[PDB]
Amino acid sequence: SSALGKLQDVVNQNAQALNTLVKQLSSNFGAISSVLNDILSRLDPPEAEVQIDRLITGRLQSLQTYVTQQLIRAAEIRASANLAATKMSECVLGQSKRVDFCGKGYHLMSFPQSAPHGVVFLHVTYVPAQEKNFTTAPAICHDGKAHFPREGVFVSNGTHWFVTQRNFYEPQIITTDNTFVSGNCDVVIGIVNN
Amino acid sequence: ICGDSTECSNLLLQYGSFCTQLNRALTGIAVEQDKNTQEVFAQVKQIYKTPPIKDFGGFNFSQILPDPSKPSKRSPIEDLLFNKVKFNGLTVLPPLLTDEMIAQYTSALLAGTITSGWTFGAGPALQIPFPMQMAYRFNGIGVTQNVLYENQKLIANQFNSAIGKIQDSLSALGKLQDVVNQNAQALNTLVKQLSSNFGAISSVLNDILSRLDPPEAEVQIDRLITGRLQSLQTYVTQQLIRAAEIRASANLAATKMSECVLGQS
Amino acid sequence: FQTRAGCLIGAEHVNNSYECDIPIGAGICASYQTQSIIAYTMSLGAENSVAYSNNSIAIPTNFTISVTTEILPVSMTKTSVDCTMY
Amino acid sequence: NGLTGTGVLTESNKKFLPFQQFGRDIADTTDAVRDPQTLEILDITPCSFG
Ligand SMILES: *[C@@H]1O[C@H](CO)[C@@H](O[C@@H]2O[C@H](CO)[C@@H](O)[C@H](O)[C@H]2NC(C)=O)[C@H](O)[C@H]1NC(C)=O
Ligand SMILES: *[C@@H]1O[C@H](CO)[C@@H](O[C@@H]2O[C@H](CO)[C@@H](O)[C@H](O)[C@H]2NC(C)=O)[C@H](O)[C@H]1NC(C)=O
Ligand SMILES: *[C@@H]1O[C@H](CO)[C@@H](O[C@@H]2O[C@H](CO)[C@@H](O)[C@H](O)[C@H]2NC(C)=O)[C@H](O)[C@H]1NC(C)=O
Ligand SMILES: *[C@@H]1O[C@H](CO)[C@@H](O[C@@H]2O[C@H](CO)[C@@H](O)[C@H](O)[C@H]2NC(C)=O)[C@H](O)[C@H]1NC(C)=O
Ligand SMILES: *[C@@H]1O[C@H](CO)[C@@H](O[C@@H]2O[C@H](CO)[C@@H](O)[C@H](O)[C@H]2NC(C)=O)[C@H](O)[C@H]1NC(C)=O
Ligand SMILES: *[C@@H]1O[C@H](CO)[C@@H](O[C@@H]2O[C@H](CO)[C@@H](O)[C@H](O)[C@H]2NC(C)=O)[C@H](O)[C@H]1NC(C)=O
Ligand SMILES: *[C@@H]1O[C@H](CO)[C@@H](O)[C@H](O)[C@H]1NC(C)=O
Ligand SMILES: *[C@@H]1O[C@H](CO)[C@@H](O)[C@H](O)[C@H]1NC(C)=O
């Protein structure tokens, strides 16, 4: 209410080309005038052919330049619309795991809004905040066995050892319900006793 | 087209805005080339640094970290890669980013990954030990994470040997080379097209002009103008078609940098 | 002021480094700040130093919900010409 | 003696063969001449523009 330069840019490029097309209807290209009612009024038919052909060649050139640059501009609008169609499928009708495809953060959800010749996506993402450091270990040694967390990380607040989930701090007592065992505790490097 | 002469400029003034369009077309291309590079490389908020130790669990990144004994501060593999790859109105503009700046963006992307895994790509960088990050990644491909901790030394040796083989396989880059060439050869043709008469008596705007009188010379100068304008349109149209191919490639690179470097795919 | 991109007249060269405003080239940008016009070398970004160690971890205690926009063109205008009438 | 052009003239250090008048570049532009009277090679660089 107080940014749509892509859309503006497109809407503009086209007007600047259409104006250049019309402004070419007033060049001679090497003729006596730019008006056919002036070559058909001060020249006899054998002499006006040579002057009309000079205009025909120029105007054909200008029209064909217009038509080439539109093909090249449409091939670029086509790729943008193909990306918009993929974002509508993958961010609006799903939850994406691709990094930085549906915003910056961890994608939660997306909402579409229509615009003059395009679409605006509103991306809702999760961003973690306010971090602390702790100290970690890869495994815990106990009774001669090595224990690994089922879905978390082992952390220490200075004197005690807990398990959290990796993206949000929520410490738990290490039990045999949130860890699993494999091997003896002399092959892992960094094991702690607890 | 004309080139110095003045009999040519007044005759070319009769064609309208054909030359304004071509300069706009070429300027758009040049502005797009800096946005290509900004989109691939400036994907990081801060300029991250590695710590002075290199205790990474037995993993050795020395061949791809920057070399402090250099003006350019490139890495060993970036030094290997950089040793393998005025006229009639023509000019080459310099890129906005030096490649010192590009090497400085890449080393910061590298230190973000080696120190924080994938957390710096979604917010603030959160440090984690490298062995534990490697174990998180083994979970992402469906392997249980003690398979990493019980095989750490072997896994680190295999990484180190595979990194060593890359320099030997380097000391390939035909893609970039192809690009570079396709452009020099198209610029050589535009200059060679200036020695053609296109059906005039000669191809040099003075000898036509000092061997005929105006009514007679304007006829030949218009043929020269027509040919030289056709050559420039061919050149600009092909540069437009060739830049849209480079843009689709830089777009693929940006997606790879996001999805393969800032995360696990 | 001499640049790798040519000779610049009417802007003063400073020693600070800001985010790029008007791109001159070869790493040099200009701005209307200090006024008048000045030159310098753009800034890649802040400087963050991760306290990495062989047994340290950082874990977040809160979050923010953020929402951003993304704008994309899908169409352009359909025009027709009549060759003969033009 | 026929070669018409514009530019800065500078003392050269190339050596023509003693029947060659002017030198050309790749892409075919005159870039050296020999002075008929004194018979010395001079490079031809363009007039600064931009
Ligand atoms: C995590 O601990 C590190 C270690 O002290 C902290 O990083 C240091 O912070 C101080 C003060 O900000 C700086 O002067 C040092 O340069 C930092 N790096 C070191 C000592 O290597 C960091 O602030 C802690 N992180 C959190 C979130 O509390
Ligand atoms: C680490 O966290 C533990 C919490 O389990 C803290 O220990 C407890 O602290 C509370 C309040 O100080 C006491 O009432 C309990 O008796 C403590 N022990 C237990 C087993 O609960 C401990 O102080 C924390 N350490 C640090 C350095 O913050
Ligand atoms: C973790 O616990 C084990 C067993 O309680 C410790 O192993 C003992 O270490 C002492 C001192 O080195 C030796 O005298 C014993 O012979 C060891 N016993 C066994 C069964 O290995 C181990 O040292 C502890 N680790 C740490 C870092 O304190
Ligand atoms: C990381 O690997 C490099 C090899 O690419 C190591 O550097 C070489 O080390 C061998 C002996 O181990 C020497 O013979 C070579 O001269 C070294 N090459 C150099 C220094 O360019 C490097 O030591 C490894 N890093 C660590 C910490 O071991
Ligand atoms: C997590 O962050 C939120 C802010 O996003 C904290 O809530 C704010 O708390 C302050 C002080 O109590 C209030 O002034 C704000 O109004 C709160 N914000 C909102 C949106 O309600 C919250 O306390 C933080 N939680 C923890 C555990 O630190
Ligand atoms: C043509 O005549 C001129 C003089 O009229 C010659 O110029 C002389 O060149 C020699 C170099 O060997 C100088 O040492 C003399 O001082 C020059 N004379 C003058 C008056 O400048 C020129 O060499 C003659 N052409 C040829 C092919 O010999
Ligand atoms: C970590 O590095 C310290 C050096 O400060 C060393 O004593 C210790 O053995 C190392 N531990 C691991 C798990 O690498
Ligand atoms: C910028 O810093 C350099 C440091 O080498 C100094 O020599 C120079 O005078 C400074 N420029 C200005 C304008 O103060």
Curated annotation (Swiss-Prot), chain A:
Ranges in a coiled coil: 8-52
Effect of residue 40 to F: In strain: Omicron/BA.1
Cystines in this chain: 91-102, 141-185
Glycosylation sites: 133, 157, 193
Listed result of changing residue 177 to H: In strain: Alpha/B.1.1.7
Consequence recorded when altering residue 13 to H: In strain: Omicron/BA.1, Omicron/BA.2, Omicron/BA.2.12.1, Omicron/BA.2.75, Omicron/BA.4, Omicron/BA.5, Omicron/BQ.1.1, Omicron/XBB.1.5, Omicron/EG.5.1
Annotated function: Subunit of the fusion protein that is processed upon entry into the host cell. Mediates fusion of the virion and cellular membranes by functioning as a class I viral fusion protein. Contains a viral fusion peptide that is unmasked after S2 cleavage. This cleavage can occur at the cell membrane by host TMPRSS2 or during endocytosis by host CSTL. In either case, this triggers an extensive and irreversible conformational change that leads to fusion of the viral envelope with the cellular cytoplasmic membrane, releasing viral genomic RNA into the host cell cytoplasm.
Name listed for the protein in its UniProt record: Spike protein S2'
Species this chain originates from: Severe acute respiratory syndrome coronavirus 2 (2019-nCoV)
Lineage of source species: Viruses, Riboviria, Orthornavirae, Pisuviricota, Pisoniviricetes
Gene, per the UniProt record: S
From Swiss-Prot, chain C:
Residues glycosylated per entry: 15, 34, 54, 62
Biotech uses: Main component of the anti-COVID vaccine Chadox1/AZD1222/AstraZeneca; in which the human tPA leader sequence is added in N-terminus to enhance protein secretion.
Posttranslational mods: The cytoplasmic Cys-rich domain is palmitoylated. Palmitoylated spike proteins drive the formation of localized ordered cholesterol and sphingo-lipid-rich lipid nanodomains in the early Golgi, where viral budding occurs.
Effect recorded for residue 34 to A: Partial loss of O-glycosylation by host GALNT1
Effect of residue 49 to L: In strain: Omicron/BA.2.12.1
Top-rank taxon, per record: Viruses
Disulfide bonds: 20-29
Consequence when changing residue 11 to V: In strain: 19B/501Y
Record localization: Virion membrane; Host endoplasmic reticulum-Golgi intermediate compartment membrane; Host cell membrane
Domain text: Contains sequence and structural motifs very similar to those of a bacterial superantigen and can directly bind and activate T-cell receptors. Activation of a broad T-cell repertoire may be involved in the hyperinflammatory syndrome in acute COVID disease. The KxHxx motif seems to function as an ER retrieval and binds COPI in vitro.
Miscellaneous comment in the UniProt entry for this protein: Variant D614G has become the most prevalent circulating sequence in the global pandemic since April 2020. The mutation is associated with higher viral loads produced in cell culture and animal models. It would not change pathogenicity nor neutralization properties vs vaccination. May be prevalent because the mutation increases virus transmission in human population.
Record family assignment: Belongs to the betacoronaviruses spike protein family.
Protein's recorded name: Spike glycoprotein
Organism this protein belongs to: Severe acute respiratory syndrome coronavirus 2
Gene that this polypeptide is encoded by: S
Portion of the full sequence shown: 643 to 741 of 1273
